[PDB]
Short mmCIF file of N, CA and C in Angstrom, two decimals:
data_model
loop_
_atom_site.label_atom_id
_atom_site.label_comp_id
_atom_site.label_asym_id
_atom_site.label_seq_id
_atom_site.Cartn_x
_atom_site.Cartn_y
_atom_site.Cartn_z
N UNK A 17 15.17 33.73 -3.04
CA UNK A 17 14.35 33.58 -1.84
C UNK A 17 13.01 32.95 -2.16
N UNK A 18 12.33 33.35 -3.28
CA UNK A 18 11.32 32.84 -3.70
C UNK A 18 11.50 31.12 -4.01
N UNK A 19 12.37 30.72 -4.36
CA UNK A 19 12.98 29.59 -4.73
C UNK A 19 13.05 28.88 -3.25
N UNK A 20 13.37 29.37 -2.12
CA UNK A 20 13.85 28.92 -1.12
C UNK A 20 12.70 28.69 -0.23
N UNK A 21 11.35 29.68 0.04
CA UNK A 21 10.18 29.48 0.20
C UNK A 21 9.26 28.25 -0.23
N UNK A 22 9.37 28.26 -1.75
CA UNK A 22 8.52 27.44 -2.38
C UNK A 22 8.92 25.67 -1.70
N UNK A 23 10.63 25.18 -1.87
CA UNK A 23 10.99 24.05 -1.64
C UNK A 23 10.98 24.14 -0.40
N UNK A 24 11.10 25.06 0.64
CA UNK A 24 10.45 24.77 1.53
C UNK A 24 8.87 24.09 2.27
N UNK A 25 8.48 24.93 1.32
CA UNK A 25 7.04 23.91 1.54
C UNK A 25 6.67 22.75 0.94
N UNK A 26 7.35 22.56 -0.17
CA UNK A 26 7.39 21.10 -0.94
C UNK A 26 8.01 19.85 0.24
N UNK A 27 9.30 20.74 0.89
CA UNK A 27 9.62 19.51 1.81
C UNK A 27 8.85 19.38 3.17
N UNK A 28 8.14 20.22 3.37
CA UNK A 28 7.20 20.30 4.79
C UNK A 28 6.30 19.25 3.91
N UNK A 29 5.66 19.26 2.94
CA UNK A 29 4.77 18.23 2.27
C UNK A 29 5.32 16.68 2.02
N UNK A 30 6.50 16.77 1.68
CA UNK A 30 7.33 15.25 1.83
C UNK A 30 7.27 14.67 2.99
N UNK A 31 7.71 15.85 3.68
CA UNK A 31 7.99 15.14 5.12
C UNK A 31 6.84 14.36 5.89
N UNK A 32 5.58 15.18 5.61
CA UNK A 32 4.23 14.46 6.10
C UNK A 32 3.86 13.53 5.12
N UNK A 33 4.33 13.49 4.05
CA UNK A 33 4.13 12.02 3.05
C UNK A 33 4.99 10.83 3.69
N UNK A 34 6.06 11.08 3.99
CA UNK A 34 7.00 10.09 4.51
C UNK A 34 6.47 9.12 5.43
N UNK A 35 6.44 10.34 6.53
CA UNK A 35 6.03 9.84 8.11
C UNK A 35 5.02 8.53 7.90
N UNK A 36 3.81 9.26 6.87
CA UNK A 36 3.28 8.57 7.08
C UNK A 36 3.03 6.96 6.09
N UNK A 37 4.13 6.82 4.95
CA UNK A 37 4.24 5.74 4.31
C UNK A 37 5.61 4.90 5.33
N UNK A 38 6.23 5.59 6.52
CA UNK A 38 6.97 5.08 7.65
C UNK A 38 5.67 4.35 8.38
N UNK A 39 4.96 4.90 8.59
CA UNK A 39 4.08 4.10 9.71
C UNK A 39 3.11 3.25 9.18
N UNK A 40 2.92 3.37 7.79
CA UNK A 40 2.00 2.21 7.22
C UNK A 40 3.08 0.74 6.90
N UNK A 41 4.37 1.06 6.60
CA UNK A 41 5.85 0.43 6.64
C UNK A 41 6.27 -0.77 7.99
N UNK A 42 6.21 0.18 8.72
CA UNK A 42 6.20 -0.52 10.28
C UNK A 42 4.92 -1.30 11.17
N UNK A 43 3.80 -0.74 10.54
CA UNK A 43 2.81 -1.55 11.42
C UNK A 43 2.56 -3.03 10.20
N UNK A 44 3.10 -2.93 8.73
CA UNK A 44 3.24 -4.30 7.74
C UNK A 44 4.32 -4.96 8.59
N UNK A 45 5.78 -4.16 9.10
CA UNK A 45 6.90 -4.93 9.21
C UNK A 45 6.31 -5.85 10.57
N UNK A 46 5.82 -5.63 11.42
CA UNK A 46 5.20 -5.87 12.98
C UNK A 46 4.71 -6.84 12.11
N UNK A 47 3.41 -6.89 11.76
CA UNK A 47 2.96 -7.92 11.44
C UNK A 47 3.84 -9.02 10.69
N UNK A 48 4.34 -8.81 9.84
CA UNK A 48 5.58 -9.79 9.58
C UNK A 48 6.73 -10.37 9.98
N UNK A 49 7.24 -9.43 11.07
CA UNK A 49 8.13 -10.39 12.04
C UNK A 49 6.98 -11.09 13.06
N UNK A 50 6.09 -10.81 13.54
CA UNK A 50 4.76 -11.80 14.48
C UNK A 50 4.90 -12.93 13.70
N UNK A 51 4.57 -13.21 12.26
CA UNK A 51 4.71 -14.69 11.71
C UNK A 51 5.42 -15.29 11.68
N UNK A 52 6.76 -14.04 11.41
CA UNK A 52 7.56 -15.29 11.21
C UNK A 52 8.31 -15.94 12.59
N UNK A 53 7.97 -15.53 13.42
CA UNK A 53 8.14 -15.75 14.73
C UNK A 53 7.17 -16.98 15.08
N UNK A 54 6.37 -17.00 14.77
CA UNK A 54 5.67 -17.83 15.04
C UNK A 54 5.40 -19.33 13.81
N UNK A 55 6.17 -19.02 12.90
CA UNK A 55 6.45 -19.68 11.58
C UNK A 55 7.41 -20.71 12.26
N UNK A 56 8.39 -19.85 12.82
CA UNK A 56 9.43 -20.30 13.35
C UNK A 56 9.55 -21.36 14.49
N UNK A 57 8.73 -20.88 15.65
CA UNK A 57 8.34 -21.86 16.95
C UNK A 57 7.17 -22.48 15.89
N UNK A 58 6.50 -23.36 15.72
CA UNK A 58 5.56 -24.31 14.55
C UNK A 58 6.85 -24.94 14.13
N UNK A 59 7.80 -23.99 13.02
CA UNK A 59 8.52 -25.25 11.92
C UNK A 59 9.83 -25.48 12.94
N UNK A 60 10.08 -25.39 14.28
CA UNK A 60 11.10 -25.58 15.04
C UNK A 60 11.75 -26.59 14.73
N UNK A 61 10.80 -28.28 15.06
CA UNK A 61 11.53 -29.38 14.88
C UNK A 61 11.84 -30.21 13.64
N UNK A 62 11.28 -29.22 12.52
CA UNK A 62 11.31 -29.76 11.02
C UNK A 62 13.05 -29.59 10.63
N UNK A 63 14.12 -30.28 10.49
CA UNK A 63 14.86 -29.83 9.40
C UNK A 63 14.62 -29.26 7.96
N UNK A 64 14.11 -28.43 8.06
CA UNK A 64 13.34 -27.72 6.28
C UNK A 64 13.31 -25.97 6.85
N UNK A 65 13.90 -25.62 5.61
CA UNK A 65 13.66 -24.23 5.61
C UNK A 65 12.19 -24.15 5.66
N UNK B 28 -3.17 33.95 -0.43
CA UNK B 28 -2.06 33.19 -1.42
C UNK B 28 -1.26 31.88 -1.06
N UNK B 29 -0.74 32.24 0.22
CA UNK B 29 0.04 31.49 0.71
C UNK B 29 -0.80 29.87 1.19
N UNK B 30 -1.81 29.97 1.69
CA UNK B 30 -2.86 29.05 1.95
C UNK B 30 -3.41 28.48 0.71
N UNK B 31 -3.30 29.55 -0.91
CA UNK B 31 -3.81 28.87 -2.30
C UNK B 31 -2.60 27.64 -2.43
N UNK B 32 -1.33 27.99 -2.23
CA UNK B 32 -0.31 27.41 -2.50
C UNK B 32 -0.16 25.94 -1.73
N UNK B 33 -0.64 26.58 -0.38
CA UNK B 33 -0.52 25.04 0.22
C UNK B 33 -1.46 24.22 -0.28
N UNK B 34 -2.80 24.45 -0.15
CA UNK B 34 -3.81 23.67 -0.38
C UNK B 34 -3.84 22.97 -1.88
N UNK B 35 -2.66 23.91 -2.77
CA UNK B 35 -2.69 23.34 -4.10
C UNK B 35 -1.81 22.06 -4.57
N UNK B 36 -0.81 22.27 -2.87
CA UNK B 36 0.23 21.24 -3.42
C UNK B 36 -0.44 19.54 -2.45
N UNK B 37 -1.27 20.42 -1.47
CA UNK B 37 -2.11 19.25 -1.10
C UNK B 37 -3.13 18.18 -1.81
N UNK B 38 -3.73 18.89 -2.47
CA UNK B 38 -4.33 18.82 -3.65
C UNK B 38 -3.66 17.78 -4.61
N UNK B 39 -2.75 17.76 -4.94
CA UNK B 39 -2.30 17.39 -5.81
C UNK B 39 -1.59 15.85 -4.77
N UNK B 40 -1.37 16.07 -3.76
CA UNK B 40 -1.03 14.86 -3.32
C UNK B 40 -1.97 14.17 -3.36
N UNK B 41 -3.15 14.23 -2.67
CA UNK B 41 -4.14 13.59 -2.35
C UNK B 41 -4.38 13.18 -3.49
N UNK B 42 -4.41 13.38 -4.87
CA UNK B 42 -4.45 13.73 -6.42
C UNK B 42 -3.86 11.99 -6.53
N UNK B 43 -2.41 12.31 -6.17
CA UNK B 43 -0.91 11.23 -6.34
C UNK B 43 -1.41 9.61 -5.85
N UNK B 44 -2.34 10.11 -4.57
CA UNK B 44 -2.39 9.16 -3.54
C UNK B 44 -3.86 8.51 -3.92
N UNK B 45 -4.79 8.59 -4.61
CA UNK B 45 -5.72 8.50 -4.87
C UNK B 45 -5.52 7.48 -6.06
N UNK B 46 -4.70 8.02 -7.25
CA UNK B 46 -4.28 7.55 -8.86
C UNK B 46 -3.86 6.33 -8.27
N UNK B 47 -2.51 6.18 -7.52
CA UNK B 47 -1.87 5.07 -6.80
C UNK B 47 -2.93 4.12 -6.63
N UNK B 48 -4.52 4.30 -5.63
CA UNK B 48 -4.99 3.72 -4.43
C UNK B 48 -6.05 2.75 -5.61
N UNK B 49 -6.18 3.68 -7.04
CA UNK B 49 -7.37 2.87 -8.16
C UNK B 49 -6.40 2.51 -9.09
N UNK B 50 -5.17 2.44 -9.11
CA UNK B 50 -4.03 1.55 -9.56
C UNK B 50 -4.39 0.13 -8.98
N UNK B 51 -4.06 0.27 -7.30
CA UNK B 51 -3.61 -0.79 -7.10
C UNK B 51 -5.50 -2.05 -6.97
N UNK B 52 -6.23 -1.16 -6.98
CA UNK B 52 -7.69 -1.38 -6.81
C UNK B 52 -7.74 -2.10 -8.56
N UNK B 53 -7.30 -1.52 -9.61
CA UNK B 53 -7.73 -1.64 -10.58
C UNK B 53 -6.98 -3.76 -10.85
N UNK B 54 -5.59 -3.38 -10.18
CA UNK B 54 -4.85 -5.00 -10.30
C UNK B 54 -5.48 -5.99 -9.24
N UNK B 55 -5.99 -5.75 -8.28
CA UNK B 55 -6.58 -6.66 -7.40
C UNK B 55 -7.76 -6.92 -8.38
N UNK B 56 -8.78 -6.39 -8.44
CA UNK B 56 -9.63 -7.03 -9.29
C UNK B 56 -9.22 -7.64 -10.46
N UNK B 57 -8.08 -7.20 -11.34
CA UNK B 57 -8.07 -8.15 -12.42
C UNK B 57 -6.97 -9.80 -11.77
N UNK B 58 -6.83 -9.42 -11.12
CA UNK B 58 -6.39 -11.04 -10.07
C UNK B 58 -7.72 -11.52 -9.44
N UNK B 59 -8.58 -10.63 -9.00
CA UNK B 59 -9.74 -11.78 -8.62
C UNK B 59 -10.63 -12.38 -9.52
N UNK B 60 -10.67 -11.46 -10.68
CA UNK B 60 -11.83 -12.49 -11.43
C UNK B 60 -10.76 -13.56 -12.45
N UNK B 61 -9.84 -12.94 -12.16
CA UNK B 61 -8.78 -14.43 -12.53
C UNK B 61 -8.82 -15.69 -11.68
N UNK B 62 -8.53 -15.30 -10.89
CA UNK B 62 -9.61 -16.45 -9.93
C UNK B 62 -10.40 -17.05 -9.90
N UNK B 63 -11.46 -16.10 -9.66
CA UNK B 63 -12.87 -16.53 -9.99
C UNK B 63 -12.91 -17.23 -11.05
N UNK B 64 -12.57 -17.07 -12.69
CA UNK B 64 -12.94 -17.94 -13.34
C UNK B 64 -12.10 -19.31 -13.69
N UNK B 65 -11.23 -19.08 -13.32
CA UNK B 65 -10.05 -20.27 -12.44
C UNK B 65 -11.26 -21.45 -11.55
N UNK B 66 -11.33 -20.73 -10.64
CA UNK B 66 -12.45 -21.64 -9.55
C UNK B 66 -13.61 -22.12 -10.16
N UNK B 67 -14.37 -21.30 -11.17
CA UNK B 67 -15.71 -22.01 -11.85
C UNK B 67 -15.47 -22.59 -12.71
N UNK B 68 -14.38 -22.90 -13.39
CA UNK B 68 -13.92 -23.80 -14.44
C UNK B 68 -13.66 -24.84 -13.70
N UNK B 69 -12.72 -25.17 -12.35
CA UNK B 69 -12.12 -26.37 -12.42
C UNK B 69 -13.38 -26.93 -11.00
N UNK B 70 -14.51 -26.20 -10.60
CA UNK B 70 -15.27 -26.58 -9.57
C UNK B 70 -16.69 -27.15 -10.27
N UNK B 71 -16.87 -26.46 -12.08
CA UNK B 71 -18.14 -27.56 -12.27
C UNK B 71 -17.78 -28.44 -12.48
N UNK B 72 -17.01 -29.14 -12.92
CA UNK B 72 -16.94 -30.31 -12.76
C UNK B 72 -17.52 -31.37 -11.88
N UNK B 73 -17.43 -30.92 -10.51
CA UNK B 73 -18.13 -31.31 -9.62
C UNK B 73 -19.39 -30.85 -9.34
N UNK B 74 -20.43 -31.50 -8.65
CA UNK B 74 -21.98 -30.81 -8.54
C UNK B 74 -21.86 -30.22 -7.12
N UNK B 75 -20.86 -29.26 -6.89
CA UNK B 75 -20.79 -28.14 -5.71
C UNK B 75 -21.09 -27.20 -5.49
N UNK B 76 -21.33 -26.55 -4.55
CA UNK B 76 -21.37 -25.12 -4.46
C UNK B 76 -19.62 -24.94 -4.33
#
């Protein structure tokens, strides 16, 4: 039980580590699909990757 | 107790997250004055700012 307590709170501590390397994750990914979206309409009429 | 425990494993994140934050602090600067002396080498040449 003591065992079961302790990793309990280790994962209540992950879990708020996660969340929040999720939301530093997603507001990079946002900004990176915006470019390339816009990379995209710019290099539209180029044949070139 | 139970509050020593949390605050200790907090502690220690903030600890994790900190080591990480003058990691990545410590490689940006050694890329900028790589730079930097990149740029003042190939800019006296010229009489520029």
């Amino acid at each position: 039980n003591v065992q079961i307590e302790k990793t309990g709170h280790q994962l209540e501590e992950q879990k708020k580590v996660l969340f929040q390397l999720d939301e530093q994750w997603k507001q990079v990914h946002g900004h990176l699909q915006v470019i390339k979206i816009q990379l995209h309409q710019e290099g539209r009429q180029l044949n070139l990757s």
